[PDB]
Write a protein that binds this ligand. Structure first.
Ligand SMILES: Nc1ncnc2c1ncn2[C@@H]1O[C@H](COP(=O)(O)OP(=O)(O)O)[C@@H](O)[C@H]1O
Ligand SMILES: Nc1ncnc2c1ncn2[C@@H]1O[C@H](COP(=O)(O)OP(=O)(O)O)[C@@H](O)[C@H]1O
Ligand SMILES: CC(C)(CO)[C@@H](O)C(=O)NCCC(=O)NCCc1ccc2c(c1)OCO2
Ligand SMILES: CC(C)(CO)[C@@H](O)C(=O)NCCC(=O)NCCc1ccc2c(c1)OCO2
Ligand SMILES: [Mg+2]
Ligand SMILES: [Mg+2]
Lengths: 304, 304
């Protein structure tokens, strides 16, 4: 009967409760399909919830700084966002970055995707892993752990590698420098994974050990597949006139064969990755946000 | 240069700063070798530190209860204590239970050892694991995870199995019932372990996912060995006149051969377990407390 999570249906979550014209523009800049009603009813209360957790942490830090007699190194609050390929992790992260910025206390909000920490294609091909991107063996997981550990050590700056969907590879010299933000949002399919998922090269302190609050964005596998295919088709269209783009390869296929191939890539790669590696980490999240048709949130679960 | 931990030498930790006659008696009741100077200089500041973390959590819970509109289920704050066999986990846990009791807000402090969650001897012998007690394969780890998960679900009571050093087995019908304490201290060598340590029977949410604050009690392996041998000899002496006691078997050996055998048990079982399974989990702790000769704390590290 009882679980470790408080449960809110959509109506209960919306009942927890407006924006500037330049905030609306920024939100529409993130995604043209993003419903402003959804932002108002779901994401605004979520940003408020997160601010309570962040504020409580800042308060505690002052209390402990007084007790411990420390100079008080500035340490970022880190929020991680996990879930299937195509569930909406990136959209959620960008909306939360925009909304969390509104508070004076924590105005510098960085967003880092774990995509960048994939091994480059040259390494993957050597290892026979070109069709296993997003699987644990495809990640430089020690480097990702070191990244969040460095932030949680108070280093003045840390560098993250960045991934390109144009070249479908790590950007050779495109490393992003992060300089002690108030908040870092760390978004990627593997942020709740741990040593057990990396038996080929074990690590013993986990990403989650350096994350303050984690969100798992959830949806049934039939919706994920349809959102995956929709995106695939959008990437194909966006590459029509860029011959040097990875997705330009799919421009040569009819839309119908493109759907067939995307469906195969879902079934053989991404659905496998979901079932074997991503979905089992769900109950490690501070909060599970569940989506239904049209990306409407229908359930929020928060750890008691 | 920089790590995820604030570092305090003994003098800095003691500088963070007295007790009742019945509190002194209780403390001396826990361990006759426990120095009251050590309690005053080390454990009192540690209990104060923990109270700040617990208090901050209680405050946050009221803020969120108002925001979320919840009835507000009482959920125990859980402190876990990890480290080598014979490092002093049990002594530390008992001292902290005594000291945390002093605050009106959190007077009901339960202490549970993970010893109880070992498979019974009948199961271990079937599996060939009688010489592997304390190793991951020797634990009913799913049951231990379910225990802390149940507490963190707000169940009115949860039952823990209890271990006996008299019979060196789980007590057949000696299960302890825990009824929603303010604080639960969960003490055992495996409390920072995770799925990776249980590849023979993986679990996907960890003990640490249901623990608020973790302590790893640390000491160099030469001190651990000497404390192990000292205890072994104390257990041997305590069993001289109990023919039905497991340690009565060692009464038949000279003290000299008893030392030899204890030394072998350390080298072959407990030191292996330390190196392979316990010590790698150290950097998962909220706090690392390091001991030197005579059990004197010489370093405290607290996560920034
Ligand atoms: N809240 C939302 N409203 C409308 N569309 C969304 C929403 N979240 C994600 N999407 C869409 O669904 C697809 C997957 O989202 P994305 O953020 O790329 O997922 P992920 O980062 O998890 O792979 C994209 O086509 C995106 O436009
Ligand atoms: N703070 C301390 N002061 C003095 N002796 C201690 C202290 N902590 C532990 N000991 C002693 O060291 C041995 C190991 O302690 P114990 O609490 O049984 O360790 P664990 O529970 O980690 O196996 C015991 O003989 C105990 O009396
Ligand atoms: C998100 C990651 C980390 C790379 O940015 C990676 O896990 C990833 O996108 N994996 C999906 C593997 C896959 O489907 N590859 C075929 C090419 C492709 C990439 C992204 C797509 C896609 C197809 O359809 C919609 O999104
Ligand atoms: C603490 C545990 C979980 C059982 O209570 C178990 O890990 C444990 O005590 N393992 C040690 C294995 C071991 O040394 N066994 C030989 C008998 C023995 C038990 C406890 C001892 C001991 C010897 O010397 C001092 O403490
Ligand atoms: Mg993405
Ligand atoms: Mg013990």
């Amino acid at each position: 009967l009882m679980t470790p999570y408080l449960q809110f249906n959509r109506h209960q979550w919306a009942a927890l409760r407006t924006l500037t014209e330049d905030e609306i523009t920024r939100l529409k800049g993130i995604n043209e399909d993003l419903s402003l009603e959804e932002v108002a009813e779901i994401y605004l209360p979520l940003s408020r919830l997160l601010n309570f957790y962040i504020s409580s942490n800042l308060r505690r830090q002052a209390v402990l700084e007084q007790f411990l007699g420390t100079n008080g190194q500035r340490i970022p609050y880190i929020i991680s966002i996990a879930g299937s390929v195509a569930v909406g992790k990136s959209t959620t992260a960008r909306v939360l970055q925009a909304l969390l910025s509104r508070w004076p206390e924590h105005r510098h909000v960085e967003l880092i995707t774990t995509d960048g920490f994939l091994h480059p294609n040259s390494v993957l091909k050597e290892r026979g892993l070109m069709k296993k991107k997003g699987f644990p063996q495809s990640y430089d997981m020690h480097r990702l752990v070191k990244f969040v550990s460095d932030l949680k050590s108070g280093v003045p700056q840390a560098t993250a590698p960045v991934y390109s969907h144009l070249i479908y590879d790590v950007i050779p010299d495109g490393d992003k420098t992060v300089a002690q933000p108030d908040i870092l949002i760390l978004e990627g399919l593997n942020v709740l994974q741990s040593g057990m998922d990396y038996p080929h090269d074990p690590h013993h302190v986990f990403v989650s050990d350096f994350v303050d609050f984690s969100i798992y964005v959830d949806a049934p596998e039939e919706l994920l597949k349809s959102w995956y295919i929709n995106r695939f088709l959008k990437f194909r269209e966006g590459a029509f006139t860029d011959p040097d783009s990875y997705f330009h390869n799919y421009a040569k296929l009819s839309k119908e064969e493109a759907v067939d191939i995307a469906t195969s890539l879902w079934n053989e790669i991404n659905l496998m990755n979901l079932k074997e590696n991503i979905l089992p980490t769900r109950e490690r999240a501070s909060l599970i946000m569940t989506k239904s048709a049209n990306h409407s949130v229908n359930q929020v679960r928060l750890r008691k």
